[PDB]
Design a binder for this molecule. Structure first.
Ligand code: GTP
Ligand code: GDP
Ligand code: TIV
Ligand code: CA
Ligand code: MG
Lengths: 67, 440, 421
C-alpha cells in the first residue's frame, strides 16, 4: 500500500511536469516558426522591390544607349 | 491567504477591470486613495477581502491586479483617473502599438516584445502571496490583444505556475458593438489556444448584455460604460465568496467541482437577477422566489442560448443580500415543477446553493437600482454550445474564401493554425453533443 | 502617439493637399500661424496624428510638399495656411514632368526622390510610433503620378512594416483634355495595386458629374471639384483625428476594409450634396459616389460610414440596419457583418449633419474598365508612345501594366460571383 501511495504522487508529479514541459516546447516551436515565416515574407517583399531598382537601372541605361 | 491575482488584458479587460475594482472598493468600504477605515490591522491581515487586496504599511489597500494593453491610451485613463492612487505604477503596463484587431500581432509580432515584462510584474504580485490560489483573466475574444496576447500569456502562465488555477472572464463578440470584421477569426484562434490552459471560463455575450441594458434599464443605446457596470455585478457575484465570509458562504472552488465534469467542458452559463431601473424598483420588492424564477428566463442570461432546448450538467445559485435557505428551497421546489429543467442521466439533479449576507452595491450615478437581494445562477448547459456554433459559422463563411487571412499570414501565421483551431472547435461542439446523449 | 506622415506630389496633389490641411486645421481649431484657439479639448486629443508640436505651442503639419516644378510650391506658400507648413519640407525640382510618367518615375523624379526621402526620414525618425503614410496625387499627370508611385516604392523599402495609403485622383476627359492620361493612369495603377495597402479612388468623372448635374454648376472649376474632395477627405479621416467609441488607425482600417491584398481600391461617398433616414439613403445612392461607378452593378465586400453632427444614434443604427436588409443582395454573404457605422459628435464646417461613405465594392471594376478602354484605344495605335520609350521604357512594361489591371478587374469579378455555398 505504501508503495502504491508513492507511485500515485510520483505519477501526479510526472504528468504535471510533462504538461509544463510540452507547453514550454510547443510555444518555443510556435514563436520560432512564426519568426521564420514573418521574416521570409518581409524578405520576399524587399527582393521584388530590389527588382524594381535593378529594372530602373536597366531603363536609365537603355535611354543613354539610344543616343 | 488564498490570494487571487486578477489580470486585465486589452481595452475590454481593462475597462471591465475599472468597473469591477471600483465596485469592489465600494463593497468593502475602500476609498479611492486605498484607505479602509474599518480595517484595524494596518499593513497586513488575513481577512476575506485580502484575497483581492494587499496592504501597505501606510494603510493603503492595493488590488492584486495587473493591467496590460499593447496601446497606452486606455490604461492612461486609469493612470489619471479617479482610482489612480489605488494602483502602483508597475501594475499598469502599456506598449506603444496595439495588435490592430489581429490575433497574430497580439500573440507574436507585438505581444512577444512585452510578454517577459508582464510575467515579471505578475511574479512580483505572486511573491507577495502566502498561498496563491490562482488567476482571474479578463479579456475580449475579438480584440487583437484580448485574443492574441491573452493566449500567449495563458500559455506562459501554465509554464511558470504549473497547474495553478486560471479562470477566465471572456467577452464574446456582438455586431452591435463590433470593432472588427475578423473578430470571429480571433475568437476561434484564442479559444483553441487557451482551451488546455483554462480551468473555467465565464463567457459574456455582449449582445446579451446589450439587450438587457436596452430592455431592463431602458438604455436606448448602451455604451461600454453601461455594459461594464452590469458585467461587474455578475463578476462581483461570482467572486463574492472569495472576498467575504459567512456561515452559508460557499467557496467558488466548490461550485467549480460541480460545474466541470470534463476538462474541456468548463464554460458555465451565468444568469443574473434582478436587473431593474430605479423607477421600476421603487415601491417594488423582488422576493427570493421572483429573482430565482428570473434565473430561468433566457432574457436574463449572460450568453444568448436556449437551455430549455438543452440538458443541464450542474445548477448553482449564488445569492447575496437578505436571503435565507428556507425561501430558497421553497422557490426551487416551485421552479422544478413548472420549468423546462432536465439534467443528463449521469449527473444528480440537486441545485447547489451559496449565500453571502453582504447586500448588493451599486456605483454612484449608475442605472441599476439598489436592491436588498440579488442572485447569480451558474449552470453547465449543453446549450452554451450554441454560442460556439454561431461563431464557428461566421468563421466558416470567411475562411472558405480565405478572406482577411493574408493579414494573419503576413504576421507569420500559417493556414494550418486556422484549420487546426477550427477542428478543435468542431470537436468541442461534438463534445457538448456527446455529454448530452443518454447512457447505454 | 500614432503619427501619420502626409505627402503631396504634383499639381493636383498639392491642391487637394493644401485644401485638406485648410479644412482639418479649422476643425481642430488652429490658425495659419500654428497656434491653438479652439474651445473643446477633443480637438487636441489626437492632434499629434497629423501635427508636430513646436516651441511656444506651435502646431506644424507633418506634411511634405513635392513637385518637379517650382510653380505650385509658391502657390501653397502664398495661399492660406501657407505660413504653417515647415519650410524645409518643401522639395522642388526645376524640370517639370510635362505629363510624362516615365520622366516622373525613372528620369526626372528619380533624381529628386532622394532629397524627398531625406525629409520623409527626418519626419519619421521623430515619431513616437509611426503608423504610416498618406499620399495625395493624380494618376493622369507625370509628377504626382510617376514620381508619386516611385516614392511609394522607395518609402516601402525603408518602411515595409508601415501602412501605405493614397488619395489618388483618377483622370477624366470631362475635366482634362490631355490625351496621354490613360497611359499615366494604367502605369500608376500597375504600381498602386502592388505597393499600397489602401487607395481612395477619387474620380474626376464622378466629381464633374456631381458638380454639374446635382450642384447645378455648368463648367465647374477645380475649386468646385476640390470642395467635394476636401469634404470627403475630412470625413474618411475623422476616425483617425478624433476620439470616439472606437478609435481607428491606418492599419485597423486596412484590416477591416481589405479582405484580399490587391482589392484595396475604395469608392468614397458623401452626403448631402436633414433627418437621419434621408442621409443614409443618399450615401448609398450612386449619385453620391466620388467614383464613377454604380454600386448596384456589383457587390460590397466591406463598407465603412461616419455620421457627423448631433443626432439620434438609435435612429442611425436602425436605418443602417434597414438599408442592409433592403439591399442585402449587394453585400457579399460570405463576409458576416461587413458594414460598420461610426459617429463623431463634432460636425463639419457649414453642415449641421453629414455622412461620409467608404465602400470596397466590386463595382469599382467599372472605373478600371473605363481607363482600360481609353488605354487600349491609344496603345493599339502606339500613339505618343515615343515619349515613354524615349526615356528608356519598353513596350512590355505597357503590356504588363495592362494585363495586371485586367487581372484586378477579373479578380473583383471573381468575388462578385462567389457564393456562400
Ligand atoms: N463589454 C465590453 N466589451 C468591450 C469593451 N471594450 C471593448 N469591448 C469588446 O472587445 C472587442 C474588441 O476587443 P478590444 O478589447 O477592444 O481590443 P484589444 O483587446 O485592445 O486589442 P487591439 O485590437 O490590439 O486593440 C469588441 O467586440 C468590443 O465589443 C468594454 O469596455 N466592455
Ligand atoms: N480634382 C482635381 N484634379 C486635378 C487638379 N489639378 C489637376 N488635376 C487632375 O490631374 C491631372 C493632371 O495631373 P497634374 O497634377 O497636373 O500632373 P503633375 O502636376 O505634373 O503631377 C488631370 O487629369 C486633372 O484632372 C485639381 O486641382 N483638382
Ligand atoms: O473606426 C473604424 N475603424 C475601422 O477599422 C473601420 C471599420 C471598417 N469596417 C469595419 C468592420 C468592423 C468594425 C470596424 C470597421 C466591418 C467592415 C468595414 C471603422 C470605421 C467605421 N466607419 C468609418 C469611416 C471612416 C473610417 C473608418 C471607419
Ligand atoms: Ca488589514
Ligand atoms: Mg486596443
Amino acid at each position: 500500500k505504501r508503495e502504491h501511495e508513492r507511485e500515485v504522487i510520483q505519477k501526479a508529479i510526472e504528468e504535471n511536469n510533462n504538461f509544463i514541459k510540452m507547453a514550454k516546447e510547443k510555444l518555443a516551436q510556435k514563436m520560432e516558426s512564426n519568426k521564420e515565416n514573418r521574416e521570409a515574407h518581409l524578405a520576399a517583399m524587399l527582393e521584388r522591390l530590389q527588382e524594381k531598382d535593378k529594372h530602373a537601372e536597366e531603363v536609365r541605361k537603355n535611354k543613354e544607349l539610344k543616343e | 491567504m488564498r490570494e487571487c491575482i486578477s489580470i486585465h488584458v486589452g481595452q475590454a479587460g481593462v475597462q471591465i477591470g475599472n468597473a469591477c475594482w471600483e465596485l469592489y472598493c465600494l463593497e468593502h468600504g475602500i476609498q479611492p486613495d486605498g484607505q479602509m477605515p474599518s480595517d484595524k490591522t494596518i499593513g497586513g491581515g488575513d481577512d476575506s477581502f485580502n484575497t483581492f487586496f494587499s496592504e501597505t504599511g501606510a494603510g493603503k489597500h492595493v488590488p492584486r491586479a495587473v493591467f496590460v494593453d499593447l496601446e497606452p491610451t486606455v490604461i492612461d485613463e486609469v493612470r489619471t483617473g479617479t482610482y489612480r492612487q489605488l494602483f502602483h505604477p508597475e501594475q499598469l503596463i502599456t506598449g506603444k502599438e496595439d495588435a490592430a484587431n489581429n490575433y497574430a500581432r497580439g500573440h507574436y509580432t507585438i505581444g512577444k516584445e512585452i510578454i517577459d515584462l508582464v510575467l515579471d510584474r505578475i511574479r512580483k504580485l505572486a511573491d507577495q502571496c502566502t498561498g496563491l490560489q490562482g488567476f482571474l483573466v479578463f479579456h475580449s475574444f475579438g480584440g487583437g490583444t484580448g485574443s492574441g496576447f491573452t493566449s500567449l500569456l495563458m500559455e506562459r502562465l501554465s509554464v511558470d505556475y504549473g497547474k495553478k488555477s486560471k479562470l477566465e472572464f471572456s467577452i464574446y463578440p456582438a455586431p452591435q458593438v463590433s470593432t472588427a470584421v475578423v473578430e470571429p477569426y480571433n475568437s476561434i484562434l484564442t479559444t483553441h489556444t487557451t482551451l488546455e490552459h483554462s480551468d473555467c471560463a465565464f463567457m459574456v455575450d455582449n449582445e446579451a448584455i446589450y439587450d438587457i441594458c436596452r430592455r431592463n434599464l431602458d438604455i436606448e443605446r448602451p455604451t461600454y460604460t453601461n455594459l461594464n457596470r452590469l458585467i461587474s455585478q455578475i463578476v462581483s457575484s461570482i467572486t463574492a465568496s472569495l472576498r467575504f465570509d459567512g456561515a452559508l458562504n460557499v467557496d467558488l472552488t466548490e461550485f467549480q467541482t460541480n460545474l466541470v465534469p470534463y476538462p474541456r467542458i468548463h464554460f458555465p452559463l451565468a444568469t443574473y437577477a434582478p436587473v431593474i431601473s430605479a423607477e421600476k424598483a421603487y415601491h417594488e420588492q423582488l422576493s427570493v422566489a421572483e429573482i430565482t424564477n428570473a434565473c430561468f428566463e433566457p432574457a436574463n442570461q449572460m450568453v444568448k442560448c436556449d437551455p430549455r432546448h438543452g440538458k443541464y450538467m450542474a445548477c448553482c445559485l449564488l445569492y447575496r443580500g437578505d436571503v435565507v435557505p428556507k425561501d430558497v428551497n421553497a422557490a426551487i421546489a416551485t421552479i422544478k415543477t413548472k420549468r423546462s429543467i432536465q439534467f443528463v442521466d449521469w449527473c444528480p439533479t440537486g441545485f447547489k446553493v451559496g449565500i453571502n449576507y453582504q447586500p448588493p452595491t451599486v456605483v454612484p450615478g449608475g442605472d441599476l437600482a439598489k436592491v436588498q437581494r440579488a442572485v447569480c445562477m451558474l449552470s453547465n448547459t449543453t446549450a452554451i454550445a450554441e454560442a460556439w456554433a454561431r461563431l464557428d459559422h461566421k468563421f466558416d463563411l470567411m475562411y472558405a474564401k480565405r478572406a482577411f487571412v493574408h493579414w494573419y499570414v503576413g504576421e507569420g501565421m500559417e493556414e494550418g493554425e486556422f484549420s487546426e483551431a477550427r477542428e478543435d472547435m468542431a470537436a468541442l461542439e461534438k463534445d457538448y453533443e456527446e455529454v448530452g446523449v443518454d447512457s447505454v | 502617439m500614432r503619427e501619420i506622415v502626409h505627402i503631396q506630389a504634383g499639381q493636383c496633389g498639392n491642391q487637394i493637399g493644401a485644401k485638406f490641411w485648410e479644412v482639418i486645421s479649422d476643425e481642430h481649431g488652429i490658425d495659419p500661424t500654428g497656434s491653438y484657439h479652439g474651445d473643446s479639448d477633443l480637438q487636441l486629443e489626437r492632434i499629434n496624428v497629423y501635427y508636430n508640436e513646436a516651441t511656444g505651442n506651435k502646431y506644424v503639419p507633418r506634411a511634405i510638399l513635392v513637385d518637379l516644378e517650382p510653380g505650385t510650391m509658391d502657390s501653397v506658400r502664398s495661399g492660406p495656411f501657407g505660413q504653417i507648413f515647415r519650410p524645409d519640407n518643401f522639395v522642388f525640382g526645376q524640370s517639370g514632368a510635362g505629363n510624362n510618367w516615365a520622366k516622373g518615375h525613372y528620369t526626372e523624379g528619380a533624381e529628386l526622390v532622394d532629397s524627398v526621402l531625406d525629409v520623409v526620414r527626418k519626419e519619421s525618425e521623430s515619431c513616437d510610433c509611426l503608423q504610416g503614410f498618406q499620399l495625395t496625387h493624380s494618376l493622369g499627370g507625370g509628377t504626382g503620378s510617376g514620381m508619386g508611385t516611385l516614392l511609394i516604392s522607395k518609402i516601402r523599402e525603408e518602411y515595409p512594416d508601415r501602412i501605405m495609403n493614397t488619395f489618388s485622383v483618377m483622370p477624366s476627359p470631362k475635366v482634362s483634355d490631355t490625351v496621354v492620361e490613360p497611359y499615366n493612369a494604367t502605369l500608376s495603377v500597375h504600381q498602386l495595386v502592388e505597393n499600397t495597402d489602401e487607395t481612395y479612388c477619387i474620380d474626376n468623372e464622378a466629381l464633374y458629374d456631381i458638380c454639374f448635374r446635382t450642384l447645378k454648376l455648368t463648367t465647374p472649376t477645380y475649386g468646385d471639384l476640390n470642395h467635394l474632395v476636401s469634404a470627403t477627405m475630412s470625413g474618411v479621416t475623422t476616425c483617425l483625428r478624433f476620439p470616439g467609441q472606437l478609435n481607428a488607425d491606418l492599419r485597423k482600417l486596412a484590416v477591416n476594409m481589405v479582405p484580399f491584398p490587391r482589392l484595396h481600391f475604395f469608392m468614397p461617398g458623401f452626403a448631402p450634396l436633414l433627418t437621419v433616414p434621408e442621409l443614409t439613403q443618399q450615401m448609398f445612392d450612386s449619385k453620391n459616389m466620388m467614383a464613377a461607378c454604380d454600386p448596384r452593378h456589383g457587390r460590397y465586400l466591406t463598407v465603412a460610414a461616419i455620421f457627423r453632427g448631433r443626432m439620434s444614434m438609435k435612429e442611425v443604427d436602425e436605418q443602417m440596419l434597414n438599408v442592409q436588409n433592403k439591399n442585402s443582395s449587394y453585400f457579399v454573404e460570405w463576409i458576416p457583418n461587413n458594414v460598420k457605422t461610426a459617429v463623431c459628435d463634432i460636425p463639419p464646417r457649414g453642415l449641421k449633419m453629414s455622412a461620409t461613405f467608404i465602400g470596397n465594392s466590386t463595382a469599382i471594376q467599372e472605373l478600371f474598365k473605363r481607363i482600360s478602354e481609353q488605354f487600349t484605344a491609344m496603345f493599339r495605335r502606339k500613339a505618343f508612345l515615343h515619349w515613354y520609350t524615349g526615356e528608356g521604357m519598353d513596350e512590355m512594361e505597357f503590356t504588363e501594366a495592362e494585363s495586371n489591371m485586367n487581372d484586378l478587374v477579373s479578380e473583383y469579378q471573381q468575388y462578385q460571383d462567389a457564393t456562400a455555398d
